[PDB]
């Protein structure tokens, strides 16, 4: 009956939607959270919902989900061919096929499918696992209509997001669906051509559950004010500092990642006009940007007033 | 109040909370038509419908009387009168009765160990409704108010519920903390006593079944699950009995050779023609059996 105990090897879903091998140190039954230690000896609090027991050697004779017996016939105990975990057919999302039955003998569970398909910068687009990924993404392992969101619809208290049902931060590599207003991890999507920038909400996205199939994404047109704000926030997150030098940090970032920026109408801009347009944007918006001049530093230094993503 | 398109939590007949959408309201009969995730639609009573606020949801009013500060829950953020809540709220982290159950209840029995297990046990010491003022049918199986269990929600006695020997009230399987095995449908072969009458943890004792009882309970359980009448003895009835033999809690019948199990069971199926119908009556094989009446097995 018990599912999680101390000293248990375990897979943990992180805010990027990725699974990391770890070990439970303490089980907080009150908070339904475990203290997990990862390979880098880093310790973090992980919700029970984002914790799966590591692959035991050999067969498993009890459902890893409910950890109990069923008296309902037609609810067989199926094992994943990868992690060798046993599932009740009704304890899986979506419903797991019985052995034989639906034609492929070898069934792979949702956890392993995501484990194989997910990847930073976007998941698999082609192959048997891309299609298996797509199949799983049509069903959510949680109740979407029951989540408890804040006013801005940026975070819910259940900390359930995306197709994976894992944790996540909207401003960190996540796209919001235009239909269900849910946020989805970058590593779980299959429609992107370029890695997401931190805080980049300049997208029109629709998830698989709403679409009933492949995702649909469109890159919105950025103003020069947006590009300056987006690059600043991205660097502010990536480098974890406030002020950035224009000529030796801000500008060399834009030109070295110009294609990855997906700037559309502004993509034609000659290198010389890039600097002048970015600099003028950085100077003309004191409500967004703060110069080093304000704090007794050089005027070519820039940072964000509040470390916030660009508004859309 | 309530309106169409409104997303609500509905307490089902199993005592569990399910998220649904209101499709139609009826203030005349105090009922609500709710559609659920699987696109199914069921009539739900308003007592089971659940919609930084300032009002007490229980008494529809604010008060003056000191001592009972309007306290809000940590999970559902509803404002409770300290004395309109059961049993009674600390004034100021507090979790109300409905959310304690929501966290603790589970198919096959609620949590036995943990802060919420002990929390619900404290909640289960009292009922949120007038038990004495309930209207029962002759068999004492159903309510007119459809109020059962510790939760006060709806329920069908034959669908995974236990009856307290002392107060005769029915209790959901998901709301109990005394069971060691999952309940089969229509299983009344128990001696159960609730937390209220006991003033503490529940007590349950499994009754000794006869072979005719085993055949009837299994056939009824299969009938409810598979939604059909006739079951093959060798292909359906006996395999189920064998696969779930441990969960049946059959007492002294446990130490019976599987060869004699088949014989004893097949014998009871053929003998008691008041309970069972062989495949002869519908021109199929005689090893096929079905219940004469789709009713749970009676207790002696």
């Amino acid at each position: 009956r018990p599912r999680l105990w101390e000293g248990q090897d375990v897979l943990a879903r992180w805010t990027d939607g990725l699974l990391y091998l770890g070990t439970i140190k303490k089980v907080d039954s009150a908070r339904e959270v475990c203290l997990v230690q990862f390979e880098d000896d880093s310790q973090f609090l992980v919700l029970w919902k984002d914790i799966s027991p590591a692959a035991l050697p050999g067969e498993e004779l009890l459902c890893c989900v409910c950890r109990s017996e069923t008296v309902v016939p037609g609810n067989r105990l199926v094992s994943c061919e990868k992690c060798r975990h046993a599932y009740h057919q009704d304890c899986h999302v979506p419903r797991a096929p019985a052995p034989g039955e639906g034609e492929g003998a070898s069934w792979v569970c949702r956890q392993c499918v995501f484990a194989i398909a997910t990847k930073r910068g976007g998941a698999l687009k082609k192959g048997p696992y891309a299609r298996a990924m797509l199949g799983m993404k049509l069903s959510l392992p949680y109740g979407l209509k029951g989540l408890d969101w804040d006013a801005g619809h940026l975070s819910n208290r259940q900390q359930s997001y995306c197709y994976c049902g894992g944790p996540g931060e909207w401003n960190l590599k996540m796209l919001q669906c235009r239909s269900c207003l849910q946020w989805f991890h970058e590593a779980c999507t299959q429609c992107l051509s370029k890695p997401l920038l931190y805080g980049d909400r300049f997208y029109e996205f629709e998830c698989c559950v709403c679409r009933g199939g492949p995702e649909k994404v469109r890159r919105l047109q950025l103003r020069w004010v947006d590009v300056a704000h987006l690059v600043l926030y991205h660097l502010s997150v990536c480098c974890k500092k406030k002020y950035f030098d224009f000529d030796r940090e801000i500008l060399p970032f834009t030109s070295e990642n110009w294609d990855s920026l997906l700037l559309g109408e502004l993509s034609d801009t000659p290198k010389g006009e890039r600097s002048s347009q970015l600099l003028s944007a950085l100077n003309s918006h004191k409500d967004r940007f703060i110069s080093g001049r304000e704090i007794k530093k050089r005027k070519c230094l820039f940072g964000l007033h509040a470390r916030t993503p660009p508004p859309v | 109040r309530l309106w169409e398109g409104q997303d609500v939590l509905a307490r089902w007949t199993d005592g569990l909370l399910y998220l649904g959408t209101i499709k139609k309201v009826d203030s005349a009969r105090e009922v609500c038509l709710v559609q659920f995730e699987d696109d199914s639609q069921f009539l739900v009573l308003w007592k089971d419908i659940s919609p930084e606020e300032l009002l007490c949801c229980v008494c529809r009013s604010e008060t003056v009387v000191p001592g009972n500060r309007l306290v809000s829950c940590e999970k559902c953020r509803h404002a409770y009168h300290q004395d309109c809540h059961v049993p009674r709220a600390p004034a100021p982290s507090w979790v109300c009765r409905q959310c304690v159950f929501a966290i603790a209840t589970k198919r096959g029995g609620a949590l036995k160990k943990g802060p919420y297990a002990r929390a619900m046990l404290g909640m289960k010491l009292s009922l949120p409704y007038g038990l004495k003022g309930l209207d029962w049918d002759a068999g004492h199986l159903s309510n007119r108010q459809q109020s059962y269990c510790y939760c006060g929600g709806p329920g069908e006695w034959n669908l995974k519920m236990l009856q307290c020997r002392s107060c005769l009230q029915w209790f959901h399987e998901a709301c109990t903390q005394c069971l060691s095995k999952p309940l089969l449908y229509g299983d009344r072969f128990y001696e159960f006593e609730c937390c209220v009458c006991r003033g503490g943890p529940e007590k349950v004792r499994r009754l000794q079944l006869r072979w005719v009882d085993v055949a009837h309970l299994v056939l009824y359980h299969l009938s409810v699950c598979c939604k059909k009448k006739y079951f093959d003895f060798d292909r359906e009835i006996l395999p189920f009995t064998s696969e779930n033999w441990d969960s049946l809690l059959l007492g002294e019948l446990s130490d019976t050779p599987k060869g004699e199990r088949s014989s004893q069971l097949l014998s009871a199926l053929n003998s008691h023609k008041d309970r069972f119908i062989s495949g002869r009556e519908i021109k199929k094989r005689k090893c096929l059996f079905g219940l004469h009446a789709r009713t749970p097995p009676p207790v002696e």
């Binding site: 979506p94 419903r95 069903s139 949680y142 | 569990l16 399910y18 995730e37 929501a102 198919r107």
Partner: peptide, 7 residues
């Protein structure tokens, strides 16, 4: 598919 609601 129906899912029992917990917080």
């Amino acid at each position: 598919v129906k899912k029992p609601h917990r917080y």
